[PDB]
RNA sequence: AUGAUGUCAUACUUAUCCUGUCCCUUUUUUUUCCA
């Protein structure tokens, strides 16, 4: 669980790399990255209460990114459950690799 | 786990805002959460076996 | 003398004991009434058929298991060489093919198991060390793109035999000891002091009569290593007539002619012989080694020595405590064997030092990047500075890159993990140095072969108690000058070595004491007191010491031991001081294990006892893996006391089948956790000796708590507003860090330990209740006082 | 859908199972061929003195066993299986040999846990990864 | 193979095996030994991760294809600024453009 | 017409702080009907 923990925040924390002129709400999505690096276990145990327990969830954002010969929808969603669901991920992903559950033409595999 | 496929498929139901238009989301999928991968990469792997047959 | 009445109270103790037990016996069986149609037993005969059949089968592969255990266990040294003839031969055959059919057999049952459960099953709705084996197959598979002989030996132990500074000196030195009874045998190392002293006295016939003889250490493995040496000389099984009995380990059957022991386990043997009638010989060697059990044995075979006069006491020791020696014995000869293998350059710093650290850094820096071959030998105080100082080795190593050749920096202490104690004594790797880092642990006992260089700090971390206010602090004290001279002597072994002092000439011959206080003077004495008073002696004024201890230590022990109850308004033993004396730990926890009667928490309060018998290294703290180990001991964190979250991880522990990498997942040491298990079942070993009935707290960890607060009511805090404060002294203490209450700060807290480090500090503590203390201490603790 | 799903996944799963259970014991019966011709083939000068030593070392081994056993509850397990693991015990009875691993020199050349990508910015310059001079 | 034989052998896998083949290889040799392949080995699925981080950040990632930590480091330029400068004209072919001898600094091997 | 004295609170200034206090050397101890 901690190593999950550990990449999950290290995923979130490689987009303000910049330590740029972020805003207010970046700026508490670092706090609670912050707190939960220094804290791991009142981390996960939120994080598991949040997987058993919620089932309706705040408002999404979407704006998009201007590519010129298309756009891209950009969806952002609020810091809490995007460590809840950091984590979900990597969980997911690795133990479905364990298991093997993708047959070895689904690809963009780690592989190559 | 029904529980975690619960909170999966409950999270891609949320409101989506932008300046001042605010909707549901209740037929696609949100590809801006953090597990649409596995998602994406499931369906289409029930997309492939529908393609190819079982015993191909 | 004192001594006589001693032995008349012990031997008087033996009969009662007996007859208590006896008693015991004729009770219980008195208490427990012994009160032991046609298709009655024609429907129980079919159901004690069942159990019979049952029973059986367990009884029955369990004696499949006996011979499956045997026919391999006897075949191993028979077989592979021997000249044997049709019948075994077929019986061999049979056995190996039948033990691989039967596990076979098994193993299909097995098979089907795990490959019937393997499939997939729908959910359902219902409200080792490799982890760098794990990650070298991901590259490979990501970089993968397809489409007699025995008589030599004798004869060479013996030729090396030949070689030792004892040899030659061997028959003046058996006449000597021939001529008087006591005989101080001063030498050094390697001399074959331990050796071949007790082969020499076998030859003798000193075995003859019946008789044994003792060599006793004060180190198990130590003991364990002397006697695997002198057995391989002896050509004979070690354990039958050269053996060794020490704690959980007996390894000595009724053949036994050369037993090895411990101290403490001498000490026991008073226990049990009080004359030492079957043994002519007690050899104990490097008596230097300042022991508890030591300078207690010193006086007990003193006094035997006087009346014993055939029983032999050769006592051996490297260094030159002589004086003393023969001195408190009555001025024995001293036999002076020269032993010293090859010459130490010992050199000086130029001037003294300021950062002793970074000096050592620079040295080692220096000693390997101009010296030849050689493996190098560097002390330090302990693991903090350590670790600090092969993080600065590896440092340096990391910025200067192959400009240098392989550093291999490898630290040791006593609790660091057991595998990584074992990484340094692998033999060098060609073009490779191998420096140690090292404690003064590796001052005795430890022997690794190839050092040539060794670096002296001329410091040390001594334990000092002052009793005045009962502080134990181990602190920093510039080495002992007997101390460096071995940090010296530790080199040479095998080529001619040096050794480096971060101190002048000056500060050595000048500024140096001889030998390190006497523990009897330094250490707290709980234990022997109540030892000493278990045997009977009620002056322990007058007693036969060597070294005795300031008036005002033991005051304070008889004060303590009254307190706790062991003495009455006298000073005597109570019933539960000698049978919470025969416990071999201190006072404190057998009194709380006394209360455990009371309370009902005796399974509790024996594993909580076990655990504070090691507890020192449970937790490993790397610094490569800080936030995984911190969380894996948050884990375990229990609202109540540190105590039972030591209970929960036995607990869990056991829980798992006593499993290794379930310490290895949860970042317990398991050389602790091993101990500590096999501690608890010695306890319950004598657990029906000091009367006690095996119940359950049945989850009321109230009651452990209160049994704890029994055993340890003088370990208690308050509150202050200016501080934790002790609660009778009123002197100013602090929470561990490592504490699992250490932000939680209770009002009323329990503590275990004594040391001020940096900080004033008590160790494994719990919250308590005030009312517990004039519940448990009404007249100790009075209520004027919360 | 599920409903029926579920009950064909249980009952398929329980036919192979009893047909993999009929193959074992048939596997079994013939390892009981296997056994009885194995001390068949048993039952039809060193020999009788280290035979004599079988039944010496052998038979003090039961006794020792039973005694063991005897006078505590199981000392035949305080005593034979502890006996055989821990460290300086193993180094002292000379127990020998009780994975790649390579040079330390290549180790921790090298650290950190995220790519130098910067996550998608651009702007810092990471084009050289060693000075200049 | 050497691998392998060094298990026979029991021997060490020395440097001298490794520094040949040090960036050679798609990981990459010098990922085997880096600090993290601790905590790394958990991390699965990580390059269709990096390809939906294009729905989550502003910004776009011109090595959505690859990850440094997981494979290796595979374009080394320090070439090209030696054979620059040499094409420029050298150092004093670079500076005689430049107000370096306004400067007066006796020799350019200072300059910060 | 502005003296200092101040146990006066407020207003203000350094876009001055909010991370920057923490950790123990060595080591030994007798055991009892099995079933």
């Not at chain 3, 030792?164 to 002091?193: C, D, M, W, Y």
């Not at chain 3, 359950?696 to 452990?704: F, L």
Request: aromatic share 10%.
């Amino acid at each position: 669980d901690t190593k999950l923990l550990i990449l999950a925040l290290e995923r979130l924390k490689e987009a303000y790399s910049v330590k740029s002129r972020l805003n207010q709400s970046q700026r508490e999505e670092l706090g609670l990255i912050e707190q939960a690096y220094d804290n791991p276990h009142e981390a996960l145990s939120r994080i598991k209460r949040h997987l058993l327990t919620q089932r309706a969830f705040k408002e999404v954002g979407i704006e998009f990114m201007d590519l010129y010969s298309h756009l891209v929808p950009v969806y952002d969603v609020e810091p809490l459950e995007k460590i809840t669901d950091a984590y979900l991920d990597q969980y997911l992903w690795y133990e479905a690799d364990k298991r093997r559950l993708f047959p070895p033409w689904i690809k963009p595999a780690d592989t190559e | 786990d029904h529980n975690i496929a619960d909170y999966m498929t409950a999270k891609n139901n949320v409101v989506i805002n932008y300046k001042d238009m605010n909707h549901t989301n209740s037929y696609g999928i949100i590809r801006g959460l953090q597990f649409a991968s596995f998602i994406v990469q499931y369906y289409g792997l029930v997309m492939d076996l529908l393609v190819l047959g079982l015993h191909r | 003398d004192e001594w006589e009445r001693t032995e008349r109270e012990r031997l008087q103790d033996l009969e009662e004991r007996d007859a208590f037990a006896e008693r015991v016996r004729q009770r219980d069986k008195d208490r427990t009434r012994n009160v032991l149609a046609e298709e009655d037993r024609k429907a129980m005969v079919p159901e004690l058929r069942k159990k019979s059949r049952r029973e059986y089968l367990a009884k029955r592969e369990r004696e499949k298991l006996e011979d499956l255990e045997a026919e391999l266990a006897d075949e191993e040294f028979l077989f592979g060489d021997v000249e044997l003839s049709r019948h075994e031969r077929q019986e061999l055959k049979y056995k190996r093919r039948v033990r691989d059919l039967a596990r076979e057999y098994r193993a299909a049952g097995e098979q089907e198991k795990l490959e019937a459960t393997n499939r997939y099953h729908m959910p359902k709705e219902t409200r080792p060390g490799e982890e760098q084996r794990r990650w070298e197959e991901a590259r490979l598979g990501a970089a993968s793109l397809k489409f007699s002989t025995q008589a030599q030996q004798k004869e060479s132990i013996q030729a090396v035999r030949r070689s030792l500074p004892v040899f030659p000196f061997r028959e003046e030195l058996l006449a000597a000891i021939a001529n008087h009874q006591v005989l101080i045998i001063e030498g050094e190392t390697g001399s074959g002091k331990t050796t071949q002293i007790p082969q020499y006295l076998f030859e003798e016939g000193y075995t003859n009569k019946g008789m044994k003889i003792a060599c006793t250490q004060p180190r198990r493995v130590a003991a364990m290593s002397v006697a695997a040496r002198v057995a391989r000389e002896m050509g004979v099984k070690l354990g039958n007539e050269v053996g060794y009995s020490i704690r959980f380990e007996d390894c000595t059957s009724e053949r036994t002619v050369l037993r090895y022991m411990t101290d403490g386990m001498l000490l026991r043997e008073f226990l049990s012989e009080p004359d030492l009638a079957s043994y002519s010989v007690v050899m104990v060697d490097e008596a230097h080694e300042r022991t508890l059990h030591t300078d207690i044995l010193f006086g007990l075979i003193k006094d035997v020595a006087r009346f014993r006069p055939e029983l032999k006491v050769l006592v051996a020791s490297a260094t030159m405590d002589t004086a003393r020696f023969s001195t408190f014995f009555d001025d024995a000869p001293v036999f002076r064997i020269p032993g010293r293998r090859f010459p130490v350059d010992i050199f000086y710093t130029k001037a003294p030092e300021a950062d002793y650290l970074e000096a050592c850094v620079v040295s080692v820096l220096q000693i390997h990047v101009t010296q030849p071959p050689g493996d190098i030998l560097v002390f330090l105080t302990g693991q903090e500075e350590i670790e600090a100082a092969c993080e600065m080795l590896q440092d340096r190593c990391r910025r200067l890159g192959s400009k240098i050749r392989e550093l291999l920096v490898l630290p040791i202490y006593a609790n660091l993990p057991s595998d990584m104690q074992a990484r340094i004594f692998q033999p060098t790797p060609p073009g490779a140095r191998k420096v140690v880092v090292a404690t003064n642990i590796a001052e005795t006992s430890l022997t690794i072969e190839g050092i040539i260089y060794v670096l002296d700090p001329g410091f040390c971390k001594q334990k000092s108690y002052n009793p005045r206010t009962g502080m134990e602090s181990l602190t920093v004290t510039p080495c002992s000058k007997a101390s460096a001279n071995q940090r010296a002597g530790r080199a040479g072994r095998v080529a001619a070595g040096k050794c480096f002092r971060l101190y002048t000439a000056w500060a050595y011959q000048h500024e140096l004491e001889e030998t390190t206080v006497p523990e009897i003077q330094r250490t707290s004495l709980g234990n022997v007191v109540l030892l000493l008073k278990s045997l009977g002696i009620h002056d322990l004024m007058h007693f036969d010491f060597l070294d005795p201890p300031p008036y005002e230590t033991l005051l304070l022990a008889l004060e303590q031991l009254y307190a706790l109850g062991a003495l009455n308004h006298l000073g005597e033993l109570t019933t539960s001081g000698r049978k919470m004396a025969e416990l071999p730990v201190d006072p404190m926890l057998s009194k709380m294990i006394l209360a455990s009667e009371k309370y009902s928490c005796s399974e509790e309060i024996l594993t909580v006892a076990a655990m504070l018998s090691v507890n020192n290294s449970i937790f490993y703290r790397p610094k490569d893996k800080v936030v995984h180990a911190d969380n894996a001991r948050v884990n375990f964190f229990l609202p109540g006391g540190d105590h039972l979250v030591l209970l929960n991880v036995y607990t869990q522990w056991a829980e798992s089948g006593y499993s290794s990498q379930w310490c290895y997942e949860n970042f317990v040491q398991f050389r602790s956790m091993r101990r500590a298990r096999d501690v608890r079942e010695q306890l319950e070993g004598l657990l029906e000796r000091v009367e006690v009935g095996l119940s359950s707290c049945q989850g009321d960890y109230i009651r452990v708590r209160k049994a704890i607060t029994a055993g340890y009511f003088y370990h208690t805090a308050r509150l202050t507003r200016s501080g934790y404060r002790t609660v009778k002294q009123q002197q100013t203490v602090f929470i561990h860090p490592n504490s699992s209450l250490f932000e939680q700060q209770p009002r009323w807290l329990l503590y275990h330990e004594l040391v001020l480090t940096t900080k004033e500090f008590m160790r494994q503590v719990l919250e308590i209740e005030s009312s517990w203390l004039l519940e448990v201490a009404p007249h100790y603790y009075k209520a004027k006082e919360l | 859908a599920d409903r029926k799903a579920r009950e064909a996944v249980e009952m398929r799963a329980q036919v192979e199972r009893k047909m993999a259970q009929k193959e074992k014991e048939k596997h079994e019966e013939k390892l009981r061929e296997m056994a009885q011709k194995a001390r068949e083939r048993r039952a039809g000068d060193g020999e009788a003195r280290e035979r004599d030593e079988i039944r010496h070392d052998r038979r003090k081994e039961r006794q020792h066993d039973r005694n063991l056993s005897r006078a505590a509850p199981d000392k035949r397990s305080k005593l034979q299986r502890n006996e055989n693991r821990d460290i300086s015990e193993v180094i002292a009875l000379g127990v020998p040999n009780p994975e790649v691993q390579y040079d330390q020199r290549l180790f921790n050349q090298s650290k950190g846990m995220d790519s130098g990508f910067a996550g998608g910015e651009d702007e810092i310059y990471n084009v050289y990864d060693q000075a200049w001079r | 193979l050497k691998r392998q034989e060094a298990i026979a052998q029991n021997r060490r896998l020395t440097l001298e095996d490794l520094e040949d083949s040090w960036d050679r290889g798609i990981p990459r040799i010098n990922t085997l030994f880096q600090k993290d392949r601790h905590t790394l080995a958990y991390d699965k699925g990580w390059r269709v991760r990096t390809d939906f981080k294009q729905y989550q950040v502003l910004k776009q990632n011109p090595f959505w294809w690859t990850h440094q930590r997981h494979d290796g480091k595979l374009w080394n330029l320090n070439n090209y600024r030696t054979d620059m400068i040499q094409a420029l004209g050298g150092v004093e072919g670079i500076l005689e453009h430049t107000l370096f001898k306004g400067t007066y600094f006796p020799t350019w091997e200072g300059l910060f």
